[PDB]
């Protein structure tokens, strides 16, 4: 059949937890603070991703050159293969030339 | 499975509603029912 037969437990979302309350504070660190820091210095996450944006192919190129040495053997083989795939896809395939 | 259709039951019932008064499998089996219901309309 494949449809639930009772209502799931109700979800309560605390809109006034500390994380929700102080969301987006210091986004104006630059203009309000003499330009000591760019807002892109509030970004946390991957080394190859802090304050940068690109398509999949570009992201892979970047991860290869920035954390390529330090990554695991099989992971890196997977990444080298990804790049090979995407290279052919983007250069040789598609609707428009 | 980031997004899964949750209400197919209701999409199915829309065709089957019309097909109830038919004879044979096509009164209940959707891939059969739909074809006859189209012709009926």
């Amino acid at each position: 059949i494949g449809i639930r037969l009772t209502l799931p437990p109700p979800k309560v979302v605390d809109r006034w937890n500390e994380k929700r309350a102080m969301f987006g504070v210091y986004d104006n660190i630059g203009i309000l603070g003499n330009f000591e820091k760019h807002p892109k210095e509030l970004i946390r996450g991957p080394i190859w991703l802090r304050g940068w944006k690109g398509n999949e192919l570009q992201r892979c190129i970047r991860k290869r050159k920035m954390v390529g040495s330090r990554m695991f053997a099989d992971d890196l083989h997977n990444l080298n293969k990804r790049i090979r795939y995407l290279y052919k896809h983007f250069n040789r395939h598609g609707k428009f030339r | 499975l980031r997004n899964r259709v949750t209400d197919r039951y209701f999409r199915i019932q829309e065709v089957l509603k019309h097909a109830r008064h038919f004879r044979g499998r096509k009164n209940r089996c959707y891939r059969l029912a739909v074809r006859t219901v189209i012709r009926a309309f």
């Binding site: 449809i3 639930r4 009772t6 209502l7 799931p8 | 899964r4 949750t6 209400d7 039951y9 209701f10």
Partner: peptide, 26 residues
């Protein structure tokens, strides 16, 4: 087990209608 609430709620209301058909209240 599918995340979502709307489809589930709809189904409960469908079941209520079927139950009413089976044994109508006095």
């Amino acid at each position: 087990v599918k995340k979502g609430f709307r489809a589930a709620f709809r189904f409960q209301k469908e079941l209520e209608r079927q139950r009413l058909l089976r044994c109508p209240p006095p």
